[PDB]
Each structure stands twice: as structure tokens, then as C-alpha cells.
Amino acid sequence: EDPQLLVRVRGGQLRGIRLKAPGGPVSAFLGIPFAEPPVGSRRFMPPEPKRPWSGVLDATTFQNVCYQYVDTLYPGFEGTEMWNPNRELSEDCLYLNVWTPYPRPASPTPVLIWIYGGGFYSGAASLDVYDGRFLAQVEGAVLVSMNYRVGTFGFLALPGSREAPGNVGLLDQRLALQWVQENIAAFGGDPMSVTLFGESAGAASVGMHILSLPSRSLFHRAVLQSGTPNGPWATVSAGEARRRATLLARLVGCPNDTELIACLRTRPAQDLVDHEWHVLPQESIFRFSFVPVVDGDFLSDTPEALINTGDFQDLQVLVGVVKDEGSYFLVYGVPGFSKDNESLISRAQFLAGVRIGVPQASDLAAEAVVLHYTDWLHPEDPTHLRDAMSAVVGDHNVVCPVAQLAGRLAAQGARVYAYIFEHRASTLTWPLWMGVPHGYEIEFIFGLPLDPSLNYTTEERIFAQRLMKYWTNFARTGDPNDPRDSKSPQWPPYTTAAQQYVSLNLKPLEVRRGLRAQTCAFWNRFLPKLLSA
Template sequence: AFFTPYIGHGESVRIIDAELGTLEHVHSGATPRRRGLTRRESNSDANDNDPLVVNTDKGRIRGITVDAPSGKKVDVWLGIPYAQPPVGPLRFRHPRPAEKWTGVLNTTTPPNSCVQIVDTVFGDFPGATMWNPNTPLSEDCLYINVVSPRPRPKNAAVMLWIFGGGFYSGTATLDVYDHRALASEENVIVVSLQYRVASLGFLFLGTPEAPGNAGLFDQNLALRWVRDNIHRFGGDPSRVTLFGESAGAVSVSLHLLSALSRDLFQRAILQSGSPTAPWALVSREEATLRALRLAEAVGCPHEPSKLSDAVECLRGKDPHVLVNNEWGTLGICEFPFVPVVDGAFLDETPQRSLASGRFKKTEILTGSNTEEGYYFIIYYLTELLRKEEGVTVTREEFLQAVRELNPYVNGAARQAIVFEYT
């Protein structure tokens, strides 16, 4: 698996516990406990001629060479900090650039996944668990991964992956996102990033304490890191392609629209997502309502006149309590916390930007995954699918499912869907 810890044979590293702030030795071949893989201990004794030691604008980092599925070698740097941990007073806020460090940071273990719900609906069914985070959950999660082919290229094209997950889940470290094959076979630098999801990444109250779109600003800061550092890994900052799937594709499309991001990349690939997807954005009013509903659910002030009190209270709550209370008041086929037209990252709705031509003019590759909706049907129509054998759906049940699964479309569109599947 790609994102199992890359610790060389016979080596040991020290890992900082995200929650306790303590250090733990992990020897090669041992399986680290699900603890916070945050800041790896710096080591000042580094060989300046070591090609795996890269001098970034914040400090030196050490990577490791591993095998790609083809048998070729690739160099990887896992868990490079690009932002300060968004904890305490920084929760819900836009990210701040990482601080500089001294010595050499060991970037050989996968980073934390950002706090999110974990899918347990179908137990250990692989089709569901394969999407669950495979590294510890922590608010300290704003890290970048870089994979480079060997021998190290010069001015290679760069592909930056943005994971999906409905803006409520996801992590760049999933085995299904193995970057090694793409880097080794296509001779490109592959970059992936962690960004905040769920309420921690997209809670909006229209205040400086909760301005919204924090997850998109995470991505934007990561893009700036790539612009400033990718040449140090053999990449060309003028040949960066963003690509993502589902919410990742929506994210890519919003970077095409945002004046803050347009100049940070060149091309884009959108897989099963667009800026006009009905689930991709909500109004400021709806976003505020959802934030106050969450505040009420976790016992915080939830009056519109007490927004600062609500944010202060929400900052004091356990992050897992927040993400586990986000779904109580939503209808079917809705994701609780998503991007919003905030006046900073997005000045206007995607529809208006597209109509007026205010977007990045570039090459775009777009498409969708075959039958991707099946994944959601098993969650939204569990009563129908719990029948052990001989699943029979009546026409009325079918029509009701069409209505529930397509709440955003008009009657003519629903009739077209019915015609397609009957």
C-alpha cells in the first residue's frame, strides 16, 4: 500500500503524538499505533549532498526512495507542513503559512487526516471502508505530499490531486490514490494535499472568526507552496495541472473561478464535479442557518444576535463532537458544510462568473465516473436494499426514490430520469 509508513530497514523515527505532545519510537517493520503523526523530529546532522534532502522555503526536509508498482523507483516526501496547525483560535479561520524550522524534518510517514466522520454503516465491508481515513484524525492536518520519478527530472510537469468526499470526508493518503504509478510511468511530479473538511473546513457565519471556505483557502495556500517550492523537487511551477474527483473536481473548478487562484496553475481536470453542481454550494443564509443548527445541537449559543458567542463556544468543543452532529437537520442528498460565496475566495455565484466570462481561460479535461451514483443509493435507500433476496421495487417506490435522490431538478428533468430507467 502506498501510504504505509516509509521507514527504511533498521531505522527508527520519533513521532509526536498529536493529542498528548509526546514522542514515541517506531522501529522499522513495526506498525505504529493510530497516533498523531504530526511533526517529525528534526535532525541537524544531514548530508548536504543527500538528494533526498530538499531545502524548501520553510526549512529542509528528508524524503525516502520506494518502489512503484511497476518496479521502478520513486522519491517521496510525505507530510510536508504548508500551514500552521489550525487549532485553538485558528479553528474555522483561514490558514496561516507554516513557520520555519531548523534542522532537517523527516517527511517519510503519511500525514494525519483532517477530522471527519468515519463510515461504519456497513461494518467492515471493503467497498465502504476503503474510503475511510487510513491515518490518525487530527485538526493538525495541513500537509502536502510530493512524489517524484527517478532519476529526478528537471522542469517536469506537475499534477496536483485534490481528493473528494462531499466536503465532509476524504484524505489524500488513501491507497486508491497511490501516486507512485502516475509519477513513475508518466514522468510527472505528483502532489497531493490535505485540507479541512466538514464544519472545521466550511462552517460559515460571515464573521472574521468564521469566514467560511477555510478548506478552499487551505487548498489555495497549498497551491502557493507548490508555486514557491516545486522546482526544488524537479517540477516546473509554470506547468501545474489541478485534478480532482467529486468535491475535489468542484474544488478545482472553483479555483478556475477564483481570482485568488487563477494564476497559481495552468490546466485542470474535473472528474465527476463542476461549480454548478447543485450540491456544491449553498447560499450565505443557508450556510449561516446550518452553522447555528450545529451550535444548537452541541449546546452552544445559536441566536443570530450572538454569532461571536457561538463561534467561541464551538471552538471549545471536541472536533469529533462537531463532525458527528452535522447531519441531523439535513434532507436527502445534501452535504452539510460546503463552499459559499464569501466575498473573498468567491465574489459571485459560479453561474454568474461563467455567464460573464470571469474565469480562467485554459484547457480543461472533464468527465464523470461510470455509475458513480450507485455509491450513494446504498446509503439513501437502505430500507429497499435490506431485503435479503429478490429485491423488488414497486413503481411508486421507484418514483419516490427519483424524487428524493434528485431534489434539485424540475419535473421535466425527473420525467427524463424516469424514462431513462423504465
Template sequence: MRPVIVTRHGAVRGTTGPDGIARFKNIPYAAAPAGPLRFAPPRPPTPWNGTRDADAYGPTAPKAPYAAPMDRLIPEVDIPGEDFLNLNVWTPDPAARLPVMVWVHGGAFSNGSGSVPGYDGTAFARDGVVLVTLNYRLGAHGFLHLGPEDTAPANLGLLDQIAALEWVRDNIASFGGDPGRVTVFGQSAGAMSIGALLAMPVAKGLFHRAVLQSGAAHHVLSPDSAARVGARLAAVLGVPPTRTDLAAVPLERLLAAQQLLRAEISARPDPALWGEAALNLMPFEPVVDRATLPRVPIEAIADGTAADVDVLVGCTRDEFRLFTVPTGLAPLVTDDLLESRAAAYGLPPLGVRAYRAAFPGAAPGDLFAEIATDWFYRLPALRLAEARSRQGAHAFVYEFVWPSPAHGGGLGACHAAEVPFVFDHVADPGFAPLLGDAPPQRLADSMHAAWVAFATTGDPGWPAYREPDRTVRRFGAPPTLAHAPREHLRALWEGVR
């Protein structure tokens, strides 16, 4: 028998498998952002009569495909349709009162969806969690800002996420979830989104714990930088830099232009052209517009914003190798390029020498991956943990260190490699190009259990991160505890990151 649940906007009919897990897919949490709503804040969905079938994934946010070779390494789903502000729910018992986890997908704010098969929530529901995945506006639709004369709200993608969390608050009890125990978790741009949500007044009270994987609270754009990106987008399209003119551009042309901007930034990361996006390498990101996002998130968090939200944060050991090894960039990095990129990150020559000493014999491309990993991911994670612990909130830090055998072992423990372990989906064929043929199930058991424990009790199973001990759970085979790992390298970035 197919289960039916009544939400505030209408009834939905899901499916139940032989495992007893009920699944509800393609539930609208906001109106379709089409026509006059394309660049408008999310609005409630139109209520429906009768019972809506919720047995298949719905449309996903418009996006260009990943460029090669990422298109082979990162699973992606593209389902056309305008009504893509939807979410999916897995529950073991609609009559229960269980912890809730809400997944915010990554994709550099321009790709990804909550409908990737590897994000299936069955394992979480099996272990007593109501799991929610969602779609939100990407690229210019989600993060366009055109400067002081642009009176429309920035950060529509973040406002979509907040609308989804409001839907969870108002409806999740009918699916067996406890609206007072909501954990948001996300990876890459999803984690960076959560870092912003922690600093957004309108998100206060919508979640109680947060897990940030390979992203924290540093990656945002100033209004000036965002306006430069918006102006360049309009120039590429040959239209005036207004929302009205950009909204009139056919979708395929807009997506192609967004993809071109990403290529331009990577080819010429000049701050004079792109502002902060030149270092972040993402043209569309959360914007500190002073309205929806009043301050740089890490600064607001350090001053006590969302101090009641416990945090689990971390990264993979070799994050940036995903972007240097498969692309062929690693062997092209020279000593001069290494020095110039390190200087752009704010690391002085003495710091580069310290990395050379820490990794004797490493090629410039390998040293660049180490430095970029620290600047992009590791240091923001540690700074967030420091800020939370100094405010008296619990903060737990992890590092994923299992090296993938893919690409001849060159990927190491790279960006995105931990995601299938968190979801207990290491056998999903979509992850095989990233993980190889035999990823360790025992590591998935350990990592997935830690995420469930944190959502359920607030304790993932190791000591909280506090100075000077700086305890870090390293997820390898087997998991271990480390105390102040890479301390001499962390100290190099004091005052920089």
C-alpha cells in the first residue's frame, strides 16, 4: 500500500519498499521560479486538490553540464522543468518523532541537484533519521547581484534553502521528523551555503546542528565583486546589465555564458577583473549584500551569531588534487606559478619554504595542491571550529584521509571523495570513477554512523575541538584521532585565514 501524507499545501502519495522505508519525491516547497518569479524571492507553492503522486524525482535547477573531466568524476542529474524548487523525503516511520537531516548539495553554486542517486536517503532512514534533499536556484538565477542600483534581493539560492527549511519546520512532523532536531549538512558549495545560513538572521531557529563538508564560512563575494561578475555576464550576452534584460535571455544562452565565465576566471584569475571570485574561482557565490547576508559569515559567527548551533566541520586531506590531477594541471605548475599563487592567497615566501620542508621532494604541482587545499578548505574549517568553540558551542572536526586508487592513486583523498561514505553508498556505480572498484565498506559504516550520531545526540563520537589540543577525527582505514595535526602549517596562516 502506498503511504499518503497531508502537507500544508496538499496530500502526497509516496512509495514504500520491502525495507519498510517510505519515500516521497518531488514535493514542491516553493512556487516555480519562472516568468516574473525568475529573479523573485521564493513564494509558497500553489495548494493542490486531491493527492499528488510523489514517486519520482522532479525537475532540477537549470545548469550547464560539468566540463570535462569533471563530467566523468562527479555524478550529475538534469531533469528539465520549471517547477524545480522541490524536495525529497525518506522516513522509516511517519508516526515517530525522529531527528531530521537536510542535505544541501554542492556544485560550485552552478551545478548539482538533490536528485543524484548517490544522495538517496535510505541508509539514513534505516538508521532512524528522516532525510531530506532539496534543489535550489543556481548560477545567475540564484546568486546574481548587479550593484547598488540592483534593488532585487541577492542570494535567491540561499533564500530557496531557507524556504525549504521552513517547509521542514511546518511539515516534517507529518513524516515522522522532529522539527526541534534538524541538522543541515552539505558538501562544497552546500557547506559554504550552510556557513552563510549560520550568519543569516532569517535562518535563525530553522536548524539546530550543522555539518559542513569541504566548505565553511569564508567563500562569499562583496557587492562590488558580484557586480563585476554580473557586468561581465551581461557583456558576454550582449545585453544591458539589468535583471529584466538578463531574464529575457533564452535559458540555453544564459547557461552557456555562465560556463564561459567559469572558464575565464580559471584562465585569468585577476582580482582587478573579478574581485574575490578570482581566488574563489566561482563566479556565482553568496553575496554580502547587507540585507539578506549582513556580514561576512565567519566574522558574524566569531562574534556569536548562531552560537546555539553545534557544528561538525572538516575536509578531505587532498581536496585540491581533484582539480589538478585529472585536468593535467599538476605537471604544468612551475616554481614561479607556485610562488605567485601562494602570494595571491596571502602566504609569504617563508610559508612556501615551510611547505617545501614539510613535503621534501614534492613537485611544484603537489605543493600547490597542498597550499590550495589549506587555503580553500582546511583553514576555513579550522577557523569555523575555533570561532564556535570560543563562543562555547560544541564544534567537532574531521579529516577524510582514505586515498582513492583512481587515476593511478593520484587523486589521494580528494574533494567529494567522502560523500558516498557519509551516505553509505560506496557501491553506487556513479561514484566508481572517483573511488575505484573496492572502496572500504567498514569506513562507510564508521563515517555514516558518526553523522547519524551527531544528528541524533550532538556527539559524533570523539572529543570536541578546543585549543590548544585541536582534536581531529581522521577517517581512514581505520579511523584514528590526531591532536593538532599539521600545526606548524596551520600557524603559517594566522592572520591570513
């Protein structure tokens, strides 16, 4: 049997499987356990490293998906399903995946580690969209992706308790990073060049690893696609975590901290997920029930405090957003919107919609939002109100958090590269009015167009290769620029002075300045003053 598929890690022996990528084979090792199954009395608790095993462990299928809510808004429709889990659901989910060139790389090759999104409430590394074969085959890189516990299982927290101290979903991630140090070299990977890269709740996670001192020993570069540790959706405070947890328990019959969590532990998983979405304080979209918590442990203070004072003199970061961040979430809450019609909306609906999109907003601040996004040359135009409602949601939750993060990281000594992803997929299945929705750069970063049977267009293939090389160049060097290309489109560092980012689309690189600068001043500088008065 094939020696390229046979690898010895500190915990046993692994048989991977050889996979065909469009222009070569790759070695894949799928379903490697990195922690003891967090079932039973281990539910809600920090993971423990995997006991050693006997024999040769099979690593050729994807393991089960962490237990999570499964979307039903559009049953059968491909643009929603593609995010739904494709393996069975289980609490027994702490496994990771590794792809690598075939043959195994001679010299040590940079590692890329991918943390999926899904609002800390869903997701899985086994999605077709996260296929690591292309990056491995084409760019010669070693790619690791992990599962982490999501929902109540990953982030339910009674802070200061021992039985549920919070953030265990992040600790799942952290163990996989320790595993990559202890084991990746056996695959050819370089433990001394590890890039984290993730999207949405993934990017938020990546950020939280930048902001937690024990994680900094485990990676060297980070990529934050369309998400941030800061902003309104990614963290709660200790007080609010305790409130949502004690309410979920009441909503499932339970019942002291120990008595309280112990009863939850005796509850079939679906009984907890049935009531997940039911503890949110106000009516919401782009607000999630269970998410990281400011515990003084993993997060010593709020990410806002931490980015505002940290020293990032060593860091290298690549941040960015898509053209239409907020459009995806509008169909999941905001009346008037729907994937099936044009979602032309009235001024009444737009006023109502802002209270949803900005649930924490007072009366005064929600009129401040309506007066800002309104085109007063066409104040009743159904098309502008629609596009603006989406802009509110995208800017409040993603684009302006990214702008604040990029600002502070760069100011505090980091090398930042900022982008905006402006190409919509020809394959895409949502209506035209959503433009480029939240999450549809990923298929291009993972090189999916290179598979000929996905019916992507030829320039999309050429586009995919440009991005695949921007990222892997970042991973190699901390600079997305080819060190052998002398074609003028160069990607400049983002700075506080010049605030320059580039646009990712089919045309060559174009350098722009200010990342919705006037509009982010409104969100980042003024509205904080407004609510606190």
C-alpha cells in the first residue's frame, strides 16, 4: 500500500487518500481527531487532547459536522443549501482535515489554516466550497481546516463557572493550532510559517486569536475575510452571556451554577438547538444567539479595548470585504425582501427595516441612520431604498468594523493589506439585486473555478489563479505581491495616512483610497457618541 498516504503523528498512524485535482493528484487526510469527543460531561467544556490510538487510523472520509441549526428558509435552493452541512450531525465533531501535494513536499512548505464562518452557530470544514485540493496541487501549499463546536455547544457560557466557562468553540480552534505545531512537519508543512485565514465568523475567530496572547505562539500571518473581532455581532459581555444561558435553560426546563449546567448536559442536542434562536434580546438580523464572550480569560478585555492598545509590531494581516455585504441577510428577517422578486421597498419599509438592521439603535440614532443613507434627490425611490437598506446592514456589521480594525492594526505597527471583492459569480444563484453577497469570494480563493465541470467561465479561472496567488504569496511572505512580477499593478499597504486598498475583479488591480471613509466616520466615530447620550 501507497507510502505517500501513510503518515505518523504523535498520536498514531494515518492512512490518507489520493485525490485528483484538475492537473495533478493530491494527498488528503480527512477526519483526523485532534481532541477527545466533547460529549456527555465534556459538553460545554474546554477540549482535551486526543488519546493515542492503535493501528492505522482511516483518514479518507470527512467526519461528522458539529451539531448546529440547519437552515430551512429556502428548502432545496442551492444558494442556501451550499452552506448547510453535508455530513451527518454529531457532537462528536472535533476533527481536522489536511491536504498536501502528491508527492509530499521535499522542503518545508508554508501552512494555511482555514476557520469557517456560520455566525458561530453553524458551519463545517467539509463543505464543497472549502475544498483544499486546488491550493495544494497548484500553489504547492499545505492546507489545514478544522471543525469547531458552534451554537450552545461552542459558546454557551456561564462566566466564572467551571462547567461552562465560555469560548470553548475558540479553544477547539486553538487546540487544532497546537496540533499543527506538534504534527504538521510530518506532512511537509512548515510549523514556522503558519497563516490563519477565515471568513465572516471565521475572520472574527482569526481576529480573536490575534487578540489572545496564548494563540500568538501558533501562527505568523492572518487573513480576515469579511469579519472582525470588533463590531456588534461577534462578542457578548459576561453579563449578557449569563442572561441568554439562564434563559435557554428555562426554555428547556432547567432547573446554583452547577445544578444549572448539569441539567442542560442531560438534554438531547436538538432540544437545545430548537430554542437557540429564541433568546436574542431584540428583533434582529445579523445577530446571533451564542458567540464568544468577554470572559477576562480568552479575551482579557473587549476587542475594542484590545485593538485600541495592543502592539502589533510583528503582525501581517490581509483584510477585506465584498461589494454587497448586507444583501444576503435581508431575506432572513426584513419584510419586503425575498430572493424571488426584485425587493423594491417603500420608505415605510425602509424605516421599519433599520430598526431590525440596527437593533440596538435608539429612536434618535435610527433617524440618524435613515437621514444618512437616504438619497435626498430621490427619497422615495424603491431601488435606492432597497440598495441603501442593504448598505446599512453591510456597513454596520462588516465594512465599517473592517475599516476600524485595519485602521488600528496599521496605526499600531502592523502591515495591513486591504481589499474589496467586486466580481459576482457567473454560476451564482441569487437575484441580481444582491450583487456580490456575503461569502462568494471564498470559491475563488479556494480555486474552485479550475474544476472544468463547475461551468465557470474562462476569465473566472484566470481570476481564481490571481487570488490563489495573492493569498499564498501572503502566506509565504506576508506580502501578496509576486516577488518575480514586474507588472505595475502592485498592492500597497493600507495606512492610516493614505488609506489605500485595491479592488479584486476581472480587470487588473486598481488602487483606491478611503474604505467608505465618510460613511465609516459616521458609524465608528459619531454613533458611539450618540447612543451614549
